[PDB]
Design an enzyme around this catalytic site. Structure first.
Site, PDB file in Angstrom:
ATOM      1  N   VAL A 196       0.947  -0.797  -0.108  1.00 45.09           N
ATOM      2  CA  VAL A 196      -0.091  -0.082  -0.106  1.00 45.09           C
ATOM      3  C   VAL A 196       1.007   1.077  -0.125  1.00 45.09           C
ATOM      4  O   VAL A 196       2.007   1.186   0.677  1.00 45.09           O
ATOM      5  CB  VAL A 196      -0.935   0.026   0.947  1.00 45.09           C
ATOM      6  N   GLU A 197       0.646   2.275  -0.838  1.00 52.68           N
ATOM      7  CA  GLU A 197       1.480   3.354  -1.050  1.00 52.68           C
ATOM      8  C   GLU A 197       0.744   4.575  -0.874  1.00 52.68           C
ATOM      9  O   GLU A 197      -0.241   4.534  -1.659  1.00 52.68           O
ATOM     10  CB  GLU A 197       2.338   3.388  -2.236  1.00 52.68           C
ATOM     11  N   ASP A 198       1.208   5.606  -0.511  1.00 54.77           N
ATOM     12  CA  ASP A 198       0.457   6.801  -0.317  1.00 54.77           C
ATOM     13  C   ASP A 198       1.382   7.892  -0.435  1.00 54.77           C
ATOM     14  O   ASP A 198       2.630   7.771  -0.397  1.00 54.77           O
ATOM     15  CB  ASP A 198      -0.303   6.964   1.290  1.00 54.77           C
TER      16      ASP A 198
END
Lengths: 229, 76, 81, 229, 81, 229, 229, 76, 229, 81, 81, 229
Positions: free
Chosen positions: I115-117
């Protein structure tokens, strides 16, 4: 050899000859399980290969120039001297070759087998040889049936055929028996394609030899038994 | 045929395809498509009036079903 | 083994794998995975009470030795020497 | 044959027999570099192939029906006549075959070699033949050592073994020597996979023949020397 | 050469490449790149002084001719004809 | 075997010998179309293969240890007894082998052919044998020309050469003729690459045997006819 | 997006829905050649993909965990605030997505096309949205017909369908349209095999979606319109 | 079908086979057999009470026709 | 995103960092089955990729010039104006990116997830941002845990890490998060070979990152936390 | 590892090998050996002082982060999500 | 060219061949022969008198530019950056 | 983006335009090593791709219907309203796109780079835009030169070109820049073959675009600058 799980035989498994189903057994020989293995003349099958490869004169899908074809083969050669009608013994008047194919009953467990033989003929009577050849048949059947039990391979049919010659006058004679192992070209397969390999095999095993010919525009080179061995 | 379907479950296929135009070629040669083979029956003998062995040979190879100019290898 | 590692630097591998269920198959046959081979030693001698035909008397004794002991029956033997 | 950079030998390089390391040399023959090449009886290695292919009766990972196995092979056949105790000379009382494998010292530079021989026996004394066979051994060793120098290939061992028969009563005899060249099936490799080819080979060269059997659920077909040649 | 171009239109190529370092290898062996072959001419013979019996003494003169001149020693010769 | 659509011959098609174009025909033999097929001595071509494989002593791009090379081959062996100057007939004084290659005129339709022969020599005069060999040549040409018509394959040249020996004193003699079928390594191709296969072949068919040597740093093993057969 | 010469569409080309031939066109739009391109609701086709991949709960031949599936896709997301019934404008009450597939008339010359769209809904009346969606249809048809003439690609049908939602209360809404590009597993093909690739495709294009289900032992997940979008 | 036969003459095939058990996989992935692709139609939206984008996404991917846990790549 | 049945992660599955087993969880978040999914800082794993690809200055096994690497990636860019200390709102003082990997408990049934933000920072206090980032972590854990239940994929760990910057003076800032999908070169694998593919992978998953370095002659680019993000 | 063995029974492998010297390359590129992939974690950002207009000044901060730390410079990034 | 020869020593080739009749096709597609790619430069701008829908107003102007000049119409464009 | 070790560019590396060598640099921009990187108009190269793919109307070797072409691409779209000559700001009067290719000096170490840009035009004077475009060029050169130093990649040339439009009256405008990544068909290669892959590439890199046309029977679609962007 043998033709096992990887093989199909021209004239029988693919491009089948009408002559094959219409064939009537010359006789039966018993084998180790107690089945009567019918024995047939291989002429449908032999003519069949001529339709596919063609002849020197009507070259069709024959093997590639310089290709390496592994074959089950035996040959034999002999002189029938100049006048000198005394055979110094590697000599003879006639020469012959033979081949039998015995289709395994269960091609998943067992291989089909080929048996091939060859020799010379020490007499000049063509008919006397012929008598002998139909004897050799039953001998080959016995060699098939022996071999069958060796590997507990019951077969479901055998197809045997011969060719030969009667030499005279210092003409040397050569008899060859050979079962070749090939792969089929796409232009022999009516509507096949280099991208549909498995369907290509199904086309050939679904055509009869007449259909294959009609669809390829090929005149039957046998038909009214025009083929001699 | 229904047999090929039993065969395929064992890893075996009977596909044998030649890359060439017109010609068949031998089982195991490079570039053939498929892992199977097709075979057939040839028995011939020609009467003609080491070399001895060779020329009558060719004569039977080009008699009837043509397999002339092939590099025959033997299995038995 | 450590020898395969010396071998691989020359382009050679000894991998020999059969696509089939149960059966081994021959070196150079199509569909084998690998570019090497495995070999083994068979010496056997077999017999069968004669007939008329020397050719067929070698063919049937042959089969008898091929299916004697280590089974190589129904194989299309090709010869190297 | 030869077995060179591409090969491994069953019973020695893969699926090794305990009998192999426990073997004691029958003798040594000198070779061109001045090394004493030990010579051994090939029985471990021969039994080894029986464990892997199995027998007609206990069929294991034998070659595929109709497959094309190239082999190093020699054979010979002979009659021992009906009564007629006079040998018209392609005839004999016994028949034998032999095979030797000589492992190259440096399998990167040199090939391992196979030597195989066969003949007939002109005497009826089984023991007299046996005497002869252990003579033939040292002869083969000499043929190995000659050949070794031909290519400056020193070997590190040789393993030689024979089989034969003593015919009588018109029973024909056939002796065959054969080193087959195969590729292994995945279901023979305990925990191998069609996706792990190189590891598959390392499994087989890391198992002993007892371990391989125990892991395959296979009863040893040799064990207490139950195998005859 | 211009002939290869006529050939290629038939499906044929004459490419024959060995994966190994130094060595040539045989047509049809696995891992060769290409669908053709290269050939050459070897005729050799020798004089190889006396021995112990048939097969073995033969085999040895063979090796002698295989390693005489153009080297094809230690090859698993298969025959075509 | 034959060399057909898939093949090239060392010394002629690739790595060509200067000696080849500079060669002068020993004679011509007529063939079925009425062309005079010139006949040449195969020495350029034979020396050529020695430059490429090298010798036992100067090993170059020879076949891999244990590799399987299919070859067109014939051999023959014979003793020339201990003193016992009476030849029990599989015996002789000299032994010879021969090979001819006949390049097809149209390599698209027809295969080039190899013819190879071998025998023993029943006389002790080396010169008498030599006379015979140059006779055998014209015989082979005739066997080429016969065969040519069999398949309506006109050739454009033939190159024939022999090797032999004159044994004495119980020295056994072996003569072999062999045309091997190989695939070339990349390190033999000056500036070739495992990623440029078809260009690799064009490099070799564009080099002469002298250029190939100079670029490989290889001393000519023939040059001033240093090679004997 | 497109599906051209390499593709087939689930529900139409393979595993065809009965619903498809039984479908009746919602209307026709004219295209550059003057053909009336019929337009249909894509529900057969959409339900069709559910039968094949299955659902989270009835997982069938869905894509592999971590696989890389290229898809034609568009999505859109929006809040419909907490109470705060004033839409700061990336906000809305409902959200929708759409997809159309237009099958090329000549799949040899032209590609079939996919058109997909998505937006938010600025009103709370579900029915008011619905009215709008059946308007969007005719708009997409016009976008199809424009595009058709761009490449002189006449189509033979179009199948269009939508999904959406009506959010309320700070529930965020996400609408996605996606056409995935996959390759079929063998265990989905009744009687297919990893060795019969081209026949495998013919099995799937010859089965109807009911037959495929009956043969796979799969309960129809649609049947009495049980599937909602 | 008869169309594939017209196609094959151009070098094109529509064969798309996955090596795996159960799962389909994507066009162009290594180890697929065949040079074609199969496609299908999915339109879904789920109402749920950067991260924002991500969790509702998964919700629509696992709604109905399951394509959950796929590494979606886009073409347009 | 995902890494499923086909993947391995650098630093964890292959070339594992000692730091990994020595890591201590920052906390745990509950997931749908009731397991406490531990959460860790991803610094071992991030440093790990630097050891393998190397830096601009110490280029090691980085991707090929012009190669096509598919990546899971997000980025964001923002100005922090010249003086004009009023942010017209796509502007900010700092900028950040984040990545989490959650290893599936059963990699046979379920995929591991990434998961990347990324975002901008509306304040100038670096420390105030930092406080926020460690908040974002627990938020990402929640987004992991939500997603987990979506597919009933329990994970066994998560590793999360961030990078950022604090711009000032019209310097534009760009934060990127990216998980690349590569295939390893042979010269990176100590003792691997282009002929031993599956063993090559086992070498890398059996080395630790220190062993890999020592065997490659590579100086640790992290070691005493020398690597900044 | 023991997991690969469970995997292989499903048709899956995790082999990912690059044909090149030094460089890694991307999953799905032609000529890679193996049917799996390896992945890793990169998060980087920078401070990259002012310019001339939108697309271009952006592109340049990008390159700056791609060549910061773990080098992935000059790659044709494709996106999955 | 001489550069390909430096390249090949690293494992790299620039061979890019389409199996089809007439059409080019994309790098990485199955059945292409070779492990390289060919690229080219297209810049075009196209238009169409508006409608209600921005999405569909970009889709149709898109197609218009794809089929303007150098034809890449009906392609499944994937993006690298 | 990039074109590295695996790529060639149409019009430059293969099928080169005479216009290319005859081109004269519009100017030079300095780069990190102190070399003056010349900058050129990309019109030869752009026209070049039109000769190869052809046009909607003169379709040549364009991409396959439904094929998956990965491209380096950017686009932009804008309305120029109905009358309402007030631009609510995603609106404008004109629209443009741009592409630059910078060939690496050392294509073994470094990749060649593509830079592409696009925007809208807030003014109606076509000429005023043009002025701006030739400004954008030097800006792109600066972005090339910045990037160059990022990876210490000196280039040897850059070729930049634009296309655009001036809309009016509610006509929407779309500008696209795209560098496609393809593989060439055999029927485009004069005398190439599916069996000669590496030679095929050498044919194309040895032909000029005029020769290629003459040999293909293709009329030049550019020649007297007939091509507009």
């Amino acid at each position: 050899x043998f033709t096992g799980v990887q093989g199909r035989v021209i004239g029988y498994d693919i491009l089948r000859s009408p002559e094959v189903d219409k064939a009537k057994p010359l006789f039966t020989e018993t084998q180790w399980d107690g089945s009567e293995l019918p024995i047939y003349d291989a002429k449908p099958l032999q003519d069949a290969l001529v339709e596919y490869f063609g002849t020197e004169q009507d070259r069709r899908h024959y093997p590639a120039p310089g290709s390496f074809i592994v074959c089950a083969n035996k040959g034999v050669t002999a002189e029938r001297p100049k006048n000198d009608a005394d055979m110094k013994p590697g000599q003879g008047y006639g020469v012959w070759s033979a081949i039998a194919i015995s289709f395994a009953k269960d091609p998943t467990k067992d291989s089909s087998m080929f048996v091939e033989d060859a020799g010379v003929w020490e007499t000049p009577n063509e008919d006397e040889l012929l008598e002998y050849l139909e004897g050799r048949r039953k001998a080959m059947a016995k060699s098939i049936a022996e071999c069958g039990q060796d590997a507990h391979a019951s077969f479901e049919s055998s197809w045997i055929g011969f060719a030969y010659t009667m030499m005279e006058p210092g003409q040397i004679g050569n008899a060859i028996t050979v079962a070749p192992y090939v792969s089929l070209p796409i232009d022999s397969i009516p509507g096949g394609s280099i991208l549909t390999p498995d369907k290509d095999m199904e086309i050939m095993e679904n055509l009869t030899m007449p259909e294959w010919l009609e669809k390829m525009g090929y005149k039957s080179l046998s038909a009214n038994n025009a083929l001699k061995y | 045929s229904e047999l090929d379907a039993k065969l395929n479950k064992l890893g075996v296929d009977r596909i044998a395809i030649s890359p060439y135009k017109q010609w068949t070629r031998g089982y195991m040669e490079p570039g053939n498509i498929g892992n199977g083979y097709v075979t057939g029956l040839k028995v011939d003998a020609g009467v003609r009036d080491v070399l001895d062995g060779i020329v009558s040979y060719d004569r039977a190879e080009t008699k009837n079903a043509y397999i002339g100019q092939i590099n025959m290898t033997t299995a038995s």
